[PDB]
Amino acid sequence: GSSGSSGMCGVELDSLISQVKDLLPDLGEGFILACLEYYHYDPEQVINNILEERLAPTLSQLDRNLDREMN
Decide: 19 and 32 in contact? Cβ < 8 Å: no
Contact present, 31 and 46 (Cβ < 8 Å): no
Degrees to nearest 5, angle at CA 24 with 22 and 29: 85
Contact criterion met (CB below 8 Å) for 30 and 66: yes
The answer to whether 65 and 31 have CB atoms below 8 angstroms apart is yes
Other C-beta atoms closer than 10 Å to the C-beta of 58 total 10
Please tell me the class of the 10-55 domain. mainly alpha
Q: Report the structure determination method.
A: NMR
Sign of the Cα pseudo-torsion (63, 25, 71, 10, in order)? positive
Report CA-CA distances (Å) from 13 to 37, 57, 61: 9, 23, 23
| Cα 22 from chain centre | 11
